[PDB]
Design a protein around this ligand. Structure first.
Ligand code: F8Z
Length: 250
């Protein structure tokens, strides 16, 4: 699948990202519309993240899911590594959230459902994501969630990772709690002005609800944000939550 830059007409800047920029592109021969992520080798080598890249690629070979952004391939020159990506035409969840400033229960419960399907899949293939947050979420052509990475900024991290203790896949369930809160409220539950205070707030699981968050929503979030990883629900228990089943379209 020997690709090169000449195989693509590059288009509109989609934005700055990890270690470089993403652009819209069309493949000359098929006219297929994609995103092209330019990674500068200088930043990757000077960050020492060749391993995470190799992992990403390897995971992308074996794993595919409708709520996980596809990587079709990659190629090199002297300077840059180029990632050829599934194009997500409704953009980032972060952009949507800034616009609406927060999401209704229907939109949240749906998003949470799609994400739980993504993770539930991921976990069975022995993959813990560890990096779900609104900045890492895109939207496909029908408004469906797309996780940008396969993964591996304290706000979304659970106590066990904050402190450096042993952690498993319950990590991602914490993150889903955080995400669920932020979707409804418009900011993450442990937000603070310094790194140091945010750490303290997470250590001690200090979150409060605004009055407009409903009893069903508090129930699911309260259950995901337990200090004890083993007290956090299974992904199926999320998918079968009465607040989820009520509000979700998917
Ligand atoms: C170092 O080893 C790795 C490991 C994984 C990767 N993969 C990777 O970089 N994938 C990727 C794919 C899409 C991305 C990003 C990152 C990225 O850089 N993000 C930022 C914000 C923080 O991680 C995640 C966002 C979802 C970002 C959205 N942006 C920049 C514009 C954009 C808009 C629409 C898009 C699109 C990209 O791709 C398809 O449709 O789009 C790269 C190097």
């Amino acid at each position: 699948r020997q690709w090169a830059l000449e195989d693509f007409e590059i288009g509109r800047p989609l934005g700055k990202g990890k270690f470089g920029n993403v652009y819209l592109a069309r493949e000359k021969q098929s006219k297929f519309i994609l995103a092209l992520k330019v990674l500068f080798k200088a930043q990757l080598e000077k960050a020492g993240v060749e391993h995470q890249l190799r992992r990403e690629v390897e995971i992308q070979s074996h794993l595919r899911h409708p709520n996980i952004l596809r990587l079709y391939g990659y190629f090199h020159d002297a300077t840059r590594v180029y990632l050829i990506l599934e194009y997500a035409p409704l953009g980032t969840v972060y952009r949507e959230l800034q616009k609406l400033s927060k999401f209704d229960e229907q939109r949240t419960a749906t998003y949470i459902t799609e994400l739980a399907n993504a993770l539930s899949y991921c976990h069975s293939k022995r993959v813990i994501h560890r990096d779900i947050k609104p900045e890492n979420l895109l939207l496909g052509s029908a408004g469906e969630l797309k996780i940008a990475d396969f993964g591996w900024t304290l706000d979304y991290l659970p106590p066990e990772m904050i402190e450096g203790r042993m952690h498993d896949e319950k990590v991602d369930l914490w993150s889903l709690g955080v995400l669920c809160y932020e979707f409804l409220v418009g900011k993450p539950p442990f937000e603070a002005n310094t790194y140091q205070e945010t750490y303290k707030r997470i250590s001690r699981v200090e979150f409060t609800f605004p009055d407009f968050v409903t009893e069903g929503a508090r129930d699911l979030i309260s259950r995901l944000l337990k200090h004890n990883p083993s007290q956090r629900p299974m992904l199926r228990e999320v998918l079968e939550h009465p607040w989820i089943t009520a509000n979700s379209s998917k």
